[PDB]
Design a protein around this ligand. Structure first.
Ligand SMILES: [Cl-]
Ligand SMILES: [Cl-]
Ligand SMILES: [Cl-]
Ligand SMILES: [Cl-]
Ligand SMILES: [Cl-]
Ligand SMILES: [Cl-]
Ligand code: NA
Length: 129
């Protein structure tokens, strides 16, 4: 599923991401924009052989199982395919665990490089929330 901007903001809010660990909703929408362009089916292979999955590009080295990432973990206890669903529940729940892991949203290098410090409220401007 390719979400619309405000559609994704509303789903994220409904699943409890607005101000989760202190990160306003615009941070999450901005991260999803540059990680996946709001596409739940986005996948990208990393140089180390792990793969990133879904709207927030969650990686198989730590967080999900895809059967092909040696030496990896599955800390969210989910098959990585769950992260590609049109239902964002698995991606949200796993993102909550990641953002609690110590480095906040810096875990998402696209968030650090393209969202952090910017006017992220713009990402939810105009939306009925
Ligand atoms: Cl957009
Ligand atoms: Cl915001
Ligand atoms: Cl694996
Ligand atoms: Cl699995
Ligand atoms: Cl959803
Ligand atoms: Cl933080
Ligand atoms: Na894994």
């Amino acid at each position: 599923k390719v979400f619309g901007r405000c559609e994704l903001a509303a789903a994220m809010k409904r699943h409890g991401l607005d101000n989760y660990r202190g990160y306003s909703l615009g941070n999450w929408v901005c991260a999803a924009k540059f990680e996946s362009n709001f596409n739940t089916q986005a996948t990208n292979r990393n140089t180390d052989g792990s793969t990133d999955y879904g709207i927030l590009q969650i990686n198989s080295r730590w967080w999900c199982n895809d059967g092909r990432t040696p030496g990896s973990r599955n800390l969210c206890n989910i098959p990585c395919s769950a992260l590609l669903s049109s239902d964002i529940t698995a991606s949200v729940n796993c993102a909550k665990k990641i953002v609690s892991d110590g480095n906040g949203m810096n875990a998402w290098v696209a968030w650090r490089n393209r969202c952090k410090g910017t006017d992220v409220q713009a990402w939810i401007r105009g939306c009925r929330l």
